[PDB]
């Protein structure tokens, strides 16, 4: 499979091709400006995604686990359906309304964890 | 508090709004591209600098460089409970590059030391 080849596959069939999509995010003066705008936009979008991974404590990883529990109010489904039956497009639609809530919690848990780490390398 | 809301707060009263401010670092129209390009390069230099110190991906990073009392002979309570980050930045501006140099050297030694501990077997 190539770029987006797993788009129609299930969530557990996907999440093994993450490097395939990840590598495709980075790559007459009016024509110059138009091309520059396209390249600058691609760079800014990439950096915002990386900044979100950074502040969540996931820098350098494609799959990272967190300490935020899943709320049944966001999606009341078990793992067999989400990972073996659903695709990522359907999942994105199902929890779109809760995306910012989850992001806020992820940010908050990193803030606590980072401080907690600072207070342990201080002992002695 | 929002962006720069903690600017007048003490150093230990801030250091909790770091994500708030981190989020704000990211024909005539060429002016806008220049403005956008500059922001990206400045962001990346800071991230690169954090990378070489071994502080990549963190907002608070502890190191192995001792604090020299010649840089600021304060009692920690003075720094974190009374002083703000603007006053602190002024107080140690003259020593910023010295500290940065030491941080770089410290990481290089640790990186070599880590390598030396990963072929023991």
């Amino acid at each position: 499979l190539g770029f987006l080849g797993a788009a129609g596959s299930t969530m557990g069939a996907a999440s093994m091709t993450l490097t395939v999509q990840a590598r495709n995010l980075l790559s007459l003066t009016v024509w110059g400006i138009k091309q520059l705008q396209a390249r600058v936009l691609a760079v800014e979008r990439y950096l915002r995604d990386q900044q979100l991974l950074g502040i969540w404590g996931c820098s350098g990883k494609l799959i990272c686990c967190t300490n935020v529990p899943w709320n049944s109010s966001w999606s009341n489904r078990n793992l067999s359906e989400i990972w073996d039956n659903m695709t990522w497009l359907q999942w994105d639609k199902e929890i779109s309304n809760y995306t910012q809530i989850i992001y806020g919690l992820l940010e908050e848990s990193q803030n606590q964890q980072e401080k907690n780490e600072q207070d342990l390398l201080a002992l002695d | 508090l929002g962006f720069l809301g903690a600017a007048g707060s003490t150093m230990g009263a801030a250091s909790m709004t770091l994500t708030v401010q981190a989020r704000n670092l990211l024909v005539w129209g060429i002016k806008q591209l220049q403005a956008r390009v500059l922001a990206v390069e400045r962001y990346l230099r800071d991230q690169q600098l954090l990378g070489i110190w071994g502080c990549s991906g963190k907002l608070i990073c502890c190191t192995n460089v001792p604090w020299n009392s010649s840089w600021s002979n304060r009692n920690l309570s003075e720094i974190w409970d009374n002083m703000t980050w603007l006053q602190w930045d002024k107080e140690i501006s003259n020593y910023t590059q010295i500290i940065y140099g030491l941080l770089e050297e410290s990481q290089n030694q640790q990186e070599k030391n880590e390598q030396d501990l990963l072929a023991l077997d």
Partner: antibody
Amino acid sequence: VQLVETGGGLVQPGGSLKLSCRASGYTFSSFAMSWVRQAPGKGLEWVSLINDRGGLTFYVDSVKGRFTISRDNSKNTLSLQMHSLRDGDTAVYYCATGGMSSALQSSKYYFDFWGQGALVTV
Amino acid sequence: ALTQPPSVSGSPGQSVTISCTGTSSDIGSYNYVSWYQQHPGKAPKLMIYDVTQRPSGVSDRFSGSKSGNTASLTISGLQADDEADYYCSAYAGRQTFYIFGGGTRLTVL
């Protein structure tokens, strides 16, 4: 400064008691706190330590699988939730302020304030 | 834990020393050796913290020091009100946060 323990008295062996400590006279959230046992006829033994923010807890190995230490900064209170309560536990339990700092303030590694102590009998 | 003499004594006005000993991995490795004074039936009070410092409100009759794996509390102008059980404690690392010795009964002659 005051620390007053209202946690309890005697429970049947293999029982669960919950101790609590109310604090006043200082900013509660700025200090780490701990529980220390005074054996009925011997000396002092440290039992548990909780960070000023409540996120980090430490226990002595002898109670690690049986005691929970909790802090609530909105009530100015500490609590210790005891489960196994084996015979060794029997002691006066003192609520104390100190035991650690928080990286951004001067170190302690000592206990600044003590309460009067709850007598827990197995 | 820490070793501490069962008792110490001396006459009023005479100095006394209460020793405390441990091992090289705790009392001799960290400079966090506090001392507490506990009267029977009462909560202990903090008298010495770190090595030599005392809390505000404690008189200068109580002082202390450490060398090697031995620490001590020195009381100068011994008073009748000093009849108390004295305890030493020490930080013993992040794995074992605190250790205490047994008490020393101070008898005023």
